[PDB]
Amino acid sequence: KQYIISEELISEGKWVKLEKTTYMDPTGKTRTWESVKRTTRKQTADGVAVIPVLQRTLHYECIVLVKQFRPPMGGYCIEFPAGLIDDGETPEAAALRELEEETGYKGDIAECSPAVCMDPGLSNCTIHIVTVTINGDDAENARPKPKPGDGEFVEVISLPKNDLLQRLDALVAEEHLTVDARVYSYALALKHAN
């Protein structure tokens, strides 16, 4: 019943653009919205985010997260490992690659979501969420070697799955970091289950 009538470019950067979207509301009235899109999409989705379940015998299962300075935020953020999908890369391949580059761990694919939206009242940005298990008892994941690109700089933070929400809340209170909404949502559900 609702649909897009036209999209007008307002401003195009190298990585992001702003558009004015005209759409039909279901009463038959024409309305406008300001919409953000990336200029890099090719792809099932813009990017991947990896839920990396670090499994080590006789240890708690950990979720592997990353801490980076995020210029839009003006500060450091704790997030799932993530990045944009390379033109002609599968989501699964992007997930293992990003996980390796950002954390050093080599993982196995458990499941892959359909493309899911990041902030749909603002942007068209989408990701696949890829659940990956990491056998922490293999020699390849003993001394995990991250492969950081020229200028990126990413710290790895592993937190136990069974207390995730409490551990994140602590990092926010003590370190003045911003936790990612996806990460927080995941943590909340771990507590809310059963």
| Least distance (Å) between residue 15 CB and ligand K0V | 4
Alpha helices in 84-163 (DSSP H): 91-103
Instruction: Give residues 54-73 in contact with a copy of itself (rule: CB under 8 A).
Output: 69-73
| φ and ψ of 95, to 5 deg | -65, -50
Instruction: Flag whether 102 is marked binding.
Output: yes
Asked if 83 interacts with Mg ion (CB under 5 A), we say yes
| φ and ψ of 81, to 5 deg | -55, 140
- Nearest to 19, CA basis, from 86, 29, 5, 1: 5
Asked if 143 interacts with Cl ion (CB under 5 A), we say no
| Least distance (Å) between residue 33 CB and ligand K0V | 4
State the residue for tokens 């080590």.
56
Size, binding site for a copy of itself by CB under 8 A: 78
CA 112, 153, 169: angle at the middle one, nearest 5? 65
Instruction: Flag whether 100 is marked binding.
Output: no
Asked if 47 interacts with Mg ion (CB under 5 A), we say no
| φ and ψ of 55, to 5 deg | -105, 115
C-alpha to C-alpha distance for 1 and 140, rounded to whole angstroms? 53
C-alpha to C-alpha distance for 64 and 49, rounded to whole angstroms? 12
Instruction: Flag whether 167 is marked binding.
Output: no
Query: Which stretch, 1-9, 73-81, 91-99, 146-154, contacts ligand K0V (CB under 6 A)?
Result: 146-154
Residues 6+ positions from 67 with CB-CB distance below 8 Å = 76, 77, 78, 79, 154, 155, 156, 157, 177
Instruction: Give residues 174-193 in contact with Cl ion (rule: CB under 5 A).
Output: 192
State the residue for tokens 């240890």.
59
**x/- string (CB under 6 A) for ligand K0V, residues 103-132?**
-------------------x----------
Instruction: Give residues 15-54 in contact with a copy of itself (rule: CB under 8 A).
Output: 15-18, 20-21, 23, 25-27, 29, 31, 33-38, 49, 51, 53
- Nearest to 172, CA basis, from 162, 161, 183: 183
Residues that bind ligand K0V (CB under 6 A): 15-16, 31, 33-34, 122, 149-152
Residues that bind Mg ion (CB under 5 A): 82-83, 98
Residues that bind Cl ion (CB under 5 A): 53, 192
Which residue numbers belong to the known binding site? 15, 33-34, 38, 70, 82, 84, 98, 102, 119, 152
